[PDB]
Every structure is written in C-alpha cells, then in structure tokens.
Amino acid sequence: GPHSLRYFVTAVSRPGLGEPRFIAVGYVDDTQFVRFDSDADNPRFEPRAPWMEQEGPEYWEEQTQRAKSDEQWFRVSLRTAQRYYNQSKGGSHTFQRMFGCDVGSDWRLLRGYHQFAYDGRDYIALNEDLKTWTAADTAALITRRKWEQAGDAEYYRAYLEGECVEWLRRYLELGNETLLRTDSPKAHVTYHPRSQVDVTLRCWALGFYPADITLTWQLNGEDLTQDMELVETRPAGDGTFQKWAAVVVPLGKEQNYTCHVHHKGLPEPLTLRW
Amino acid sequence: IQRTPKIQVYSRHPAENGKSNFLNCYVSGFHPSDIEVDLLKNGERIEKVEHSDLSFSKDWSFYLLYYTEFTPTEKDEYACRVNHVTLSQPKIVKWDRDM
Amino acid sequence: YYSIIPHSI
C-alpha cells in the first residue's frame, strides 16, 4: 500500500506580545508521530506516538536544531512578507509550510511537497516536477526568482527523493504494528423523527482507519447530495475516525433510500438501509 | 482571509451511562489560528481538558481536537463553547448522544 | 525526518 510522510508547520506573529508562535507537527499517513512547540515548557522536538519513544537522543537533538533553525527563518519570513505587502507592524500574520513525500507500494516517490502559505492563502509551491515553482501573486514572484537563482528546488529534491523516503520506511517499520493496519468502518443507519411529513435518516461510519472514506445516499439507484448533510471526518481520539451523512426523507418511504460506504478496508462497498 | 470553525461535539465510544469514556470537541476549517475552546459540564468550564497539537488541512485551514475523560449519566449535560474572531459571540454546541 | 528551509522568502 501507499504511504505518506508530512510535516505541517505554523508560525504566527504576535506584535506587542513577544516572539512569534512556532509549531511543527509530523504525520505518517493519518497518524501524528512528532511535534515541536515553541510555547511548551521546554520546547523540543519530541515523540507523539509510542513507537517513536525508542529513538535515541541524537535523533531528538538534531531534529530540535532543525526546528529551531526554521523558527528563526519563519520570524524573518514574517517580517519580509509584512514588507512585501506593505502591512502594519501591529497586526498578527500567519506563515505556514507543508512538506514531505508520498510513496507507492514499491516505496518509491510518487510526489514530493514543499509549499508555503501566507495568512492562510497559497504563497509559493514546489511543482510536481520538483524543479519549478508556482507563485500565487507578484510578491511570491519575487520569492520565486530568488529561490530559482539560489537553486532551492535541487536542494529540496535531494531531501524528498532520499532522506524523506528513507526515514518514512524506518517509521513504517518502527510502527509496523499500528501503521500498517486497516480498520474497516462499522456502519449503520439511524432513524429520527423530524416533521410530520418528513424524517431524518443518518448514516454512520465509525472506528475506521485510514481517514479517507466515502458516504453517499441514493434514492432508487441514482444520487442525492445537494441537500444531504455531510459532516467532516473527525478523530475518535483512539487512532480511528468517524463520519456521518444524513438525508431528509418523507415518511413511509425510508426503504427507498440506501447509504453506500466506500473504504479501503471494504473489499466490496456497503449498502445500508434503516 | 477568514474562515469560521466547524464544531462537532461527540463521545469517543458509543455512550453508556456509568461507563468511562472521552468527550470530544473537534473544531476544524478555521483561520486564523487563535481560538478559544472549552468543554462544559452543566454550563461550567471543565478543567482537565487536553487538546491536540495545532495542525492544518490541504486548504491551510486549522483543526484541533479538545477532549476530556468523562463518565456520562442520564442527567449530566455537556457542551463545547467556542470563540473565534469570525464569531460575534461564543458558540455553544450541546452534546447530543445521537446527532 | 524534519528538514529546514535555507533562507527567507
């Protein structure tokens, strides 16, 4: 099966309150496994999955140094963006980075990522070719020229093709017990009364891993979604996920509606009725 | 520039009275990152609440899970209270054992 | 494995 290593890094300026917030979290697939948090008691790169607790001090020390390096350059980047956009020094702004790698069953690289956002909007992204950049506006075009001239894509490509993939394999061995699992959804339809003409049918999917899932309602074979309510997939807190989808259906014709569930752990999809 | 949080309040396991469990408040899809989240028992702020490390989605919007260990009863009422720059006042979402 | 950015935007 395919797998992903991803880091999500957030810096937030807080003028008049002190130095920016800086937090980095790392995920293997849908499982978080590390963090660095500037606002912690003793900010340090540290495990957030039990199968990471056996890595030695050299791992945490080197990773801590790398996070602290980024903390410094995110501070600089926040100031530079403020200058690029000619913004007040008084307001709070956000700078985000996501990077990492997707690998296929053969565990070679399917896609490498290095992309950035300013105040929650695309700023600059390394393209799938790991050679060129997509700039989101003319400020980011300035960055693009600087990073092209500096040869940044080659630097990142070397990480993405080598280190990123090789450490992803190590993580997948360290967590072989829990990371390679597939928990199929336990699904059911629940009835609740609504109107006097209509009724709510809620299709539940529970306890599944990975998070990717498809829930759809259909009425006698075709499809329903333009008023079907569909909540975001949510963590249970125990490493599994939950989701539901509901339709309003007039009374007596509940039998007419089916919920369909698609998930990796389901050889064939589920068709469910109340 | 601004995204309002989606709020969901729910238990980790299906809820049985007298049995230990975890009460969750999942807040997602919001921007900027500052946000106030409390879990309430009968309207009162719960102290022993933990939360996940700030992370974000493909569209750069943030998500957080707040959670607390609880033993539900028939009479005890739980909710999540959220405030964010996008909300004119705190939003209180009640825990409903079924929705 | 975390990897750094080399400079500013």
3-state helix, strand, coil in chain C (%, to 5): 0, 0, 100
CATH number for the domain harbouring residue B6: 2.60.40.10
User: Which positions in chain C touch A84 (Cβ < 8 Å)?
Assistant: 9
Which residues, at least 6 apart from A256, have a Cβ–Cβ distance to it below 8 Å?
A: A219, A220, A249
Which method was used?
X-ray
Q: Quote the minimal CA–CA distance from A144 to chain C in Å.
A: 8
The SS3 assignment for A49 reads coil
Which residues, at least 6 apart from B34, have a Cβ–Cβ distance to it below 8 Å?
A: A12, A92, B84, B85
- Count contacts between A and B (CB, < 8 Å): 75
Q: Please tell me whether residues A13 and A146 are part of one structural domain.
A: yes
Instruction: Decide if A40 touches B, using CB distance below 8 A.
Output: no
Cα-flanking dihedrals φ and ψ of residue B35, to 5°? -160, 150
Which residues, at least 6 apart from B41, have a Cβ–Cβ distance to it below 8 Å?
A: B70, B76, B77, B78
Q: Quote the minimal CA–CA distance from B86 to chain A in Å.
A: 14
Amino acid, single-letter form, for residue A135 = A
How many domains is chain B partitioned into structurally? 1
CB atoms within 10 A of CB A92: 17
Q: Quote the minimal CA–CA distance from B31 to chain A in Å.
A: 7
User: Which positions in chain A touch C2 (Cβ < 8 Å)?
Assistant: 7, 24, 26, 34, 36, 45, 63, 66-67, 70
Q: Quote the minimal CA–CA distance from C6 to chain A in Å.
A: 8
How many domains is chain A partitioned into structurally? 2
User: Which positions in chain A touch C5 (Cβ < 8 Å)?
Assistant: 70, 73, 97
Asked if residue A170 lies in contact with residue A163, where contact means CB atoms within 8 angstroms, the answer is no
Strand (E) or helix (H) holding A78: helix A57-84
Q: Please tell me whether residues A132 and A211 are part of one structural domain.
A: no
Question: Which residue range(s) make up the domain with B19?
Answer: 1-99
Which candidate in A10, A23, A206 is best for mutational testing of the B interface (most B CBs within 10 A)? A10
Q: What resolution in angstroms, rounded to 1 decimal? A: 1.8
Asked if residue A113 lies in contact with residue A122, where contact means CB atoms within 8 angstroms, the answer is no
Q: Please tell me whether residues A34 and A127 are part of one structural domain.
A: yes
Q: Please tell me whether residues A143 and A89 are part of one structural domain.
A: yes
Domain boundary among A131, A161, A181: A181
Q: Which of residues 1-9 of C touch A (CB under 8 A)?
A: 1-9
Question: Which residue range(s) make up the domain with A132?
Answer: 1-181
The SS3 assignment for A15 reads coil
The reply to whether residue A234 touches residue B26, judged by beta carbons under 8 angstroms, is yes
Q: Please tell me whether residues A177 and A187 are part of one structural domain.
A: no
Q: Please tell me whether residues A141 and A223 are part of one structural domain.
A: no
Beta bridge partners of A112: A101
Compute the distance between CA of residue B11 and CA of residue A18 in angstroms, rounded to an integer. 37
A118: tokens are 């300013």
Angle between the A138-150 and A57-84 helix axes, to the nearest 10 degrees?
A: 130
Asked if residue A115 lies in contact with residue A129, where contact means CB atoms within 8 angstroms, the answer is no
CATH number for the domain harbouring residue A141: 3.30.500.10
The SS3 assignment for A179 reads helix
Domain boundary among A163, A181, A199: A181
Distances (CA, A) of A262 to A211, A240, C1: 11, 16, 32
Domain boundary among A160, A181, A202: A181
Closest by CA to C7, choosing from A155, A49, A265, A126, is: A155
Strand (E) or helix (H) holding A63: helix A57-84
Q: Please tell me whether residues A147 and A189 are part of one structural domain.
A: no
Q: Please tell me whether residues A212 and A243 are part of one structural domain.
A: yes
Which candidate in B55, B63, B70, B85 is best for mutational testing of the A interface (most A CBs within 10 A)? B55
Helix residue spans in A97-250 (DSSP H): 138-150, 152-158, 164-174, 176-179
Going by the DSSP 8-state scheme, the letter that residue A255 receives in this structure is G
DSSP secondary structure string, B32-99? SS--EEEEEETTEEPSS-EEPPPEE-TTS-EEEEEEEEE---SS--EEEEEE-TT-SS-EEEE--TT-
Closest by CA to A70, choosing from B53, C9, B55, B64, is: C9
The reply to whether residue B24 touches residue A92, judged by beta carbons under 8 angstroms, is no
Cα B33-B35-B37 angle, rounded to 5 deg:
140
Instruction: Decide if A92 touches B, using CB distance below 8 A.
Output: yes
Q: Please tell me whether residues A9 and A76 are part of one structural domain.
A: yes
Q: Please tell me whether residues A98 and A218 are part of one structural domain.
A: no
Q: Which of C1, C4, C9 sits opposite A69 (nearest CB)?
A: C4
CATH number for the domain harbouring residue A226: 2.60.40.10
Instruction: Decide if A119 touches B, using CB distance below 8 A.
Output: yes
Q: Please tell me whether residues A187 and A139 are part of one structural domain.
A: no
Compute the distance between CA of residue B81 and CA of residue B37 in angstroms, rounded to an integer. 6
Burial class (CB within 10 angstroms; exposed 0-12, middle 13-18, buried 19+) of A29? buried
A37-65: buried (b, 16+ CB within 10 Å) or exposed (e) per residue? Answer: bbeeeebebbbbbebbeeeeeebbeebbe
Asked if residue A204 lies in contact with residue A188, where contact means CB atoms within 8 angstroms, the answer is yes
Q: Please tell me whether residues A127 and A149 are part of one structural domain.
A: yes
